[PDB]
């Protein structure tokens, strides 16, 4: 029958993506792919068999057009008139990692397994990360050809 992982088959690898001059959605799609495990042949949609994904230089993410000023990240407090919006530039200068996070989190499944997958995502605005002990492999975002 068709393969299912059993309790020790989920191997974790650490990848690291330099988000310098990389397109936001491009990076986020790639990272969600790795975090979910679509790049793996052991992929089982009921399993977080994905890989850890570090993102560095999140502040240097590339955003096309006027999205830096006319795309808003909205948020609601639950209270009336509690809609607070903040552009992507405002968000980049305040909380740089939040744009990359939000992008990936939206590209991920909105479920309990998605929540479990978020934990493998580490995002850092500089070029440096503390997860060097884990020996992360650099991951260039390629495009398979045809």
């Amino acid at each position: 029958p068709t393969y299912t992982p059993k309790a020790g088959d989920t191997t974790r690898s650490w990848y690291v993506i330099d988000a310098s001059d990389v397109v936001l959605g491009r990076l986020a799609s790639a990272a969600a792919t790795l975090l979910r495990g679509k790049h793996k042949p052991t992929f089982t949609p009921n399993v977080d068999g994905g890989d850890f994904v570090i993102v560095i230089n999140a502040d240097k993410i590339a955003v096309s057009g006027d999205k830096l000023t006319k795309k808003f990240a909205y948020r609601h407090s639950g209270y009336p008139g509690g809609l607070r919006k903040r552009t992507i530039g405002e968000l980049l200068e305040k909380h740089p990692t939040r744009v990359v996070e939000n992008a990936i989190i939206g590209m991920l499944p909105h479920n309990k397994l998605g929540r479990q997958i978020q934990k493998k995502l580490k995002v850092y605005a500089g070029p440096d990360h503390p997860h060097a002990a884990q020996q992360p492999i650099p991951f260039e975002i390629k495009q398979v050809a045809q």
Partner: protein, 124 residues
Amino acid sequence: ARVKRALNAQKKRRTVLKASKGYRGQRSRLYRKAKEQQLHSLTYAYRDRRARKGEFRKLWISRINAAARANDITYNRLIQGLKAAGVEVDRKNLAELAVSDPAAFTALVDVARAALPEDVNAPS
């Protein structure tokens, strides 16, 4: 003659309630509410036995795509090359190879890449 119907009646009740083990609340305990769910449950099972083929196909395809893109080829051109090479292997066994015999998967990938044309974006 007058017929006490409990004896014939309780049978379907026993049947349904024995089928409705594991259900929450009324659905496991009461005939009238277990019956409602056994309708839904067997409808869902009929639907899902047919959608299961699609779901497993979806899974096998995901795994094949993964292994293929690890061997530097897309799923679509892999399938194209296999059909051009006359490999009638099904996606189930391709996925099983991708998991258990990546070398054989690479061999089939090479086969498909050979059988593909030189310009896949040409009419031919």
